[PDB]
């Protein structure tokens, strides 16, 4: 019985930066995974978040 986090629910507009937007998305999914006690998904998403933030920093050069 699968899991599907709400897309940063009923919130702000789309970010002007598409990567920062994706970072907001993953941050929201992590909050929901943590709240649901789904540590596998927390770990998967945190790993993804780590990669996104690294890529964001590199773009700022």
């Amino acid at each position: 019985e699968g899991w599907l986090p709400l897309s940063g629910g009923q919130g702000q507009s789309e970010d002007s930066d598409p990567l920062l937007q994706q970072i907001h998305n993953i941050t929201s999914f992590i909050r929901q995974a943590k709240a649901a006690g789904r540590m596998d998904e927390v770990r998967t998403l945190q790993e993804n978040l780590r990669q996104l933030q690294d890529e964001y920093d590199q773009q700022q050069t």
């Binding site: 699968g2 599907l4 598409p18 998305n25």
Partner: protein, 169 residues
């Protein structure tokens, strides 16, 4: 819980119904509030296939042009993809070669791809025939199903068939 873990992508033009397919697969409902994917959505689901439990880590990518760099960054490591077009929109079908090339380039040439002709419930509006899409699939080594995220037709089957082929050649 699970014997295997496959990273899956859902890729294709904006509006083809990628998020609705993911929502149909996991929640078994047609998504009422849908809007252009604002990056890349995540879903997780375990299926029984080839006598085994396979956990799918599914990344539903954005088709919109401004998210090209962001979506492409998800490709590496993907074992499987649902490559989606809209059967009512010829332009979405025309874009399949570029999606397919980029997917096989950025993920392994090994990536197992199932072509999904989505919105088949809107047959009156059909702009892509089943037979021509079958031909395109045959020629490009793709599995192929026409799907409906609205009715649920062939949706679970798309994900299952993809997993099945990864496991057994």
């Amino acid at each position: 819980t699970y014997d295997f873990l496959f990273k899956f992508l859902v890729i294709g033009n904006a509006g083809t119904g990628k998020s609705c397919l993911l929502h149909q697969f996991i929640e078994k409902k047609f998504k009422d509030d849908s809007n252009h994917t604002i990056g890349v959505e995540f879903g997780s689901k375990i299926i029984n296939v080839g006598g085994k439990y396979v956990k799918l880590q599914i990344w539903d990518t954005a088709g919109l042009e401004r998210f090209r760099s962001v979506t492409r960054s998800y490709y590496r490591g993907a074992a499987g993809a649902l490559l989606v077009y809209d059967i009512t929109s010829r332009e979405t079908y025309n874009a399949l070669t570029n999606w397919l090339t980029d997917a096989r380039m950025l993920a392994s040439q090994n990536i197992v791809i199932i072509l999904c002709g989505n919105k088949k419930d809107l047959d009156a509006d059909r702009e892509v025939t089943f037979l021509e899409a079958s031909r395109f699939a045959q020629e490009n080594e793709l599995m192929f199903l026409e799907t409906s995220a609205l009715t649920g037709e062939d949706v679970e089957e798309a994900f299952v068939q993809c997993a099945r082929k990864i496991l057994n050649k």
